[PDB]
Amino acid sequence: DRPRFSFSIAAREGKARTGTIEMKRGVIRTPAFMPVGTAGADIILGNTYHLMLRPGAERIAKLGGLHSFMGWDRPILTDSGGYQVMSLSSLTKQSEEGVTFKMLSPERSIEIQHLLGSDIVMAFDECTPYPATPSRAASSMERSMRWAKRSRDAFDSRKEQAENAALFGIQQGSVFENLRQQSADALAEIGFDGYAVGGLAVGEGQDEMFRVLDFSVPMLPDDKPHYLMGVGKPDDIVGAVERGIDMFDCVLPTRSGRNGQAFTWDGPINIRNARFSEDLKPLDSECHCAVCQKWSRAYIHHLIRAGEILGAMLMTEHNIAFYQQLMQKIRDSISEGRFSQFAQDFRARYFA
Amino acid sequence: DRPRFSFSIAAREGKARTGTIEMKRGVIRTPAFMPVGTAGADIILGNTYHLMLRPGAERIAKLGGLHSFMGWDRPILTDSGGYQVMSLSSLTKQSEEGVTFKMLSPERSIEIQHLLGSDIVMAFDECTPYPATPSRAASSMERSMRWAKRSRDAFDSRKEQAENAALFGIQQGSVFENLRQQSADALAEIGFDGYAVGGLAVGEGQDEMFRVLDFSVPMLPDDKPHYLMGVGKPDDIVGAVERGIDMFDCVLPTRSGRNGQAFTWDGPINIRNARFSEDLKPLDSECHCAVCQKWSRAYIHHLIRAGEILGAMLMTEHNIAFYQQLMQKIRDSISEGRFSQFAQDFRARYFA
Ligand SMILES: Nc1nc2c(CCc3ccccc3)c3nc[nH]c3cc2c(=O)[nH]1
Ligand SMILES: Nc1nc2c(CCc3ccccc3)c3nc[nH]c3cc2c(=O)[nH]1
Numbered sequence: 131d132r133p134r135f136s137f138s139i140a141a142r143e144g145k146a147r148t149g150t151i152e153m154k155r156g157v158i159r160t161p162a163f164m165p166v167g168t169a170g171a172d173i174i175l176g177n178t179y180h181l182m183l184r185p186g187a188e189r190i191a192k193l194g195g196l197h198s199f200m201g202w203d204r205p206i207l208t209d210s211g212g213y214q215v216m217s218l219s220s221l222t223k224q225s226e227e228g229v230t231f232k233m234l235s236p237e238r239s240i241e242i243q244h245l246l247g248s249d250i251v252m253a254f255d256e257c258t259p260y261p262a263t264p265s266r267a268a269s270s271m272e273r274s275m276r277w278a279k280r281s282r283d284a285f286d287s288r289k290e291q292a293e294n295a296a297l298f299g300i301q302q303g304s305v306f307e308n309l310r311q312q313s314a315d316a317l318a319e320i321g322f323d324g325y326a327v328g329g330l331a332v333g334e335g336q337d338e339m340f341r342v343l344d345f346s347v348p349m350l351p352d353d354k355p356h357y358l359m360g361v362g363k364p365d366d367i368v369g370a371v372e373r374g375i376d377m378f379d380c381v382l383p384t385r386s387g388r389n390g391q392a393f394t395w396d397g398p399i400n401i402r403n404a405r406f407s408e409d410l411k412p413l414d415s416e417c418h419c420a421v422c423q424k425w426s427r428a429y430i431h432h433l434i435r436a437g438e439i440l441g442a443m444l445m446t447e448h449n450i451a452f453y454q455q456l457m458q459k460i461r462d463s464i465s466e467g468r469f470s471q472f473a474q475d476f477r478a479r480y481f482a
Numbered sequence: 483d484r485p486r487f488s489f490s491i492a493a494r495e496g497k498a499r500t501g502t503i504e505m506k507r508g509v510i511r512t513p514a515f516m517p518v519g520t521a522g523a524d525i526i527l528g529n530t531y532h533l534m535l536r537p538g539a540e541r542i543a544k545l546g547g548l549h550s551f552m553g554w555d556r557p558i559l560t561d562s563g564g565y566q567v568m569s570l571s572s573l574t575k576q577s578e579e580g581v582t583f584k585m586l587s588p589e590r591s592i593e594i595q596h597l598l599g600s601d602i603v604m605a606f607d608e609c610t611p612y613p614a615t616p617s618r619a620a621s622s623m624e625r626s627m628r629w630a631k632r633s634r635d636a637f638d639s640r641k642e643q644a645e646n647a648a649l650f651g652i653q654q655g656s657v658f659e660n661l662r663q664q665s666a667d668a669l670a671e672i673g674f675d676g677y678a679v680g681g682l683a684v685g686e687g688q689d690e691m692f693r694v695l696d697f698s699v700p701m702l703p704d705d706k707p708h709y710l711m712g713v714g715k716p717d718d719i720v721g722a723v724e725r726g727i728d729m730f731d732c733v734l735p736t737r738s739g740r741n742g743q744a745f746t747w748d749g750p751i752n753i754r755n756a757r758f759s760e761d762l763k764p765l766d767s768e769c770h771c772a773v774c775q776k777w778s779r780a781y782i783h784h785l786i787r788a789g790e791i792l793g794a795m796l797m798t799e800h801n802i803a804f805y806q807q808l809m810q811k812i813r814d815s816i817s818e819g820r821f822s823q824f825a826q827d828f829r830a831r832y833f834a
């Protein structure tokens with residue numbers, strides 16, 4: 131049987147790495163993109179915030195857990211819920227115990243993720259608002275580090291979870307190198323199975339994010355996976371892999387798919403635009419996905435313009451397939467020692 | 483090679499028949515349900531009214547026709563467009579030449595369907611409003627019969643269409659037996675490849691529709707397929723097959739699928755209802771579709787309640803699959819001489 135958690139690096143190029151995470155439910159090839167399970171990927175995302183509200187974490191456990199519920203027997207990552215409460219909820223009330231909204235604490239977060247049955251459990255953190263002064267960023271980071279220890283203990287107190295899932299710590303510190311170093315030191319001292327770079331993809335722009343990644347990723351344990359949360363556009367991913375990131379999630383493939391935007395090797399396109407009404411080429415000339423095997427930009431443009439659900443499904447299937455082809459190309463080129471050439475070739479074509 | 487059009491009846495029970503329509507692009511097993519191609523079926527529907535407006539019939543021909551456009555190389559039926567103009571358009575203006583809206587004529591209808599490339603072409607008729615007085619129903623029917631002859635001639639003037647497609651005449655006459663007889667006589671004298679019962683599914687209720695079918699279907703040529711337009715609910719189809727109908731279309735599978743209603747052997751259910759929030763059974767216990775193979779009512783209820791497009795796609799896939807399983811069961815039981823028992827068993831379970 132596979133171990134509970136084992137990360138091995140098969141090849142490197144500069145700061146980039148490619149390898150595998152072994153877990154009881156399957157293997158995850160890295161760098162990995164992790165799509166929302168609500169729709170090939172090796173791991174999908176559960177929506178902790180939505181699930182604790184409908185139908186509730188207890189109801190999901192009663193239904194047999196998220197794997198059974200969603201019909202997905204491979205690994206599932208779940209976020210810890212505070213980021214989502216802090217962005218999509220009202221009348222939020224924060225304190226050292228946790229957050230109240232209309233009480234999510236480290237312990238409750240971990241228990242919710244346990245009842246959901248997810249394989250990769252995120253520590254309960256505070257995604258510090260951007261921008262932030264040094265003092266507020268430090269205060270926030272210090273509380274997240276106390277909350278990280280409380281998450282560690284809650285996770286270790288549940289035998290089924292401690293023996294079958296994995297726990298990731300989330301680095302905070304806003305854009306400040308010394309706070310990122312302190313956060314990294316505190317996490318490493320607690321000890322986690324993986325480490326996420328939190329508090330980015332919060333409006334900072336790609337230049338600032340890349341700058342923060344430049345000094346932040348090397349503070350994490352090299353021998354454990356690095357998860358950049360909430361990122362990102364295809365060029366964000368390529369640049370973040372260049373900076374040592376192993377795992378990604380982003381709202382873009384599914385949000386774009388529902389709003390008429392398709393990702394291609396030549397950049398994104400809005401398929402609703404009239405220039406596609408008679409374009410017989412598939413969404414992308416090279417894409418191996420099923421949509422691109424059967425249908426033209428013209429027919430997908432027509433479905434979406436007509437309001438047919440089929441169109442949004444075909445766009446979403448293509449976008450998710452495109453992201454996985456991107457990750458496959460990143461892994462192959464790292465493994466073959468030509469990732470640097472690939473990144474240059476990707477950006478020249480993607481931005482042309 | 484298959485012929486342009488050949489209908490053969492393999493077995494009968496009472497007025498019910500089962501058999502096949504051979505056409506150059508494929509075989510159609512009857513009784514047949516014909517789903518909207520905009521999403522196994524043997525024939526799909528093109529939306530003449532929408533397509534003549536976006537992107538236009540000429541643009542579809544420029545793109546290679548509807549088979550190429552939709553990625554579907556099997557038969558396609560198209561309606562003649564007037565029913566749709568008369569129900570979904572504004573500022574309609576009618577005359578002996580045709581209908582003007584914001585000029586669809588028999589000749590233009592046929593040419594539009596030719597440019598679309600459909601395999602089964604509907605005569606350009608007037609679906610008489612319901613209810614209607616004898617005099618208005620007769621006037622309307624008499625114009626549709628003149629229009630049927632004009633459709634015949636337009637169809638025969640286009641060599642590629644006359645040699646590769648099929649043309650159906652549409653009986654009108656509202657609920658009046660003598661007008662239905664006159665309409666049937668006029669169509670048979672013109673001569674068509676199949677005959678549709680038009681002017682039903684316009685609000686009359688199942689009792690009245692079945693009454694009209696009782697005397698109307700036997701006026702049509704027995705040796706040609708009978709197409710009841712716009713029908714219907716599963717119990718409508720079963721009863722119409724009992725009355726000699728061979729072909730059906732209906733908005734229900736796709737409209738229901740987008741609004742939370744799933745058809746089952748035990749009747750329809752609204753999956754959004756709270757009673758399904760913890761129901762681990764598939765949408766239907768017997769259904770062989772992929773959705774019912776993998777997912778519970780509970781998870782589909784959750785997707786739809788959450789607004790996820792995945793849910794509406796899974797409901798639609800199930801509903802269309804259910805209709806085709808219904809038709810398969812009708813064909814098998816007719817062919818095995820137990821359709822009467824089947825209809826009784828279907829209604830007892832469906833309405834229980
Ligand atoms: N816990 C946490 N989540 C973040 C997310 C959501 C990632 C997520 C993972 C899995 C499911 C849903 C959401 C961010 N999205 C954009 N920027 C983000 C920052 C953070 C962060 O600092 N902490
Ligand atoms: N031409 C025509 N169409 C009808 C339709 C649409 C069937 C159709 C077929 C293929 C595609 C779209 C629509 C009806 N729908 C409900 N009742 C109906 C009656 C008629 C009718 O009398 N004539």
Ligand SMILES: [Zn+2]
Nearest residue numbers: 417419422448
């Ligand atoms: Zn594709």
Ligand SMILES: [Zn+2]
Nearest residue numbers: 769771774800
């Ligand atoms: Zn089903």
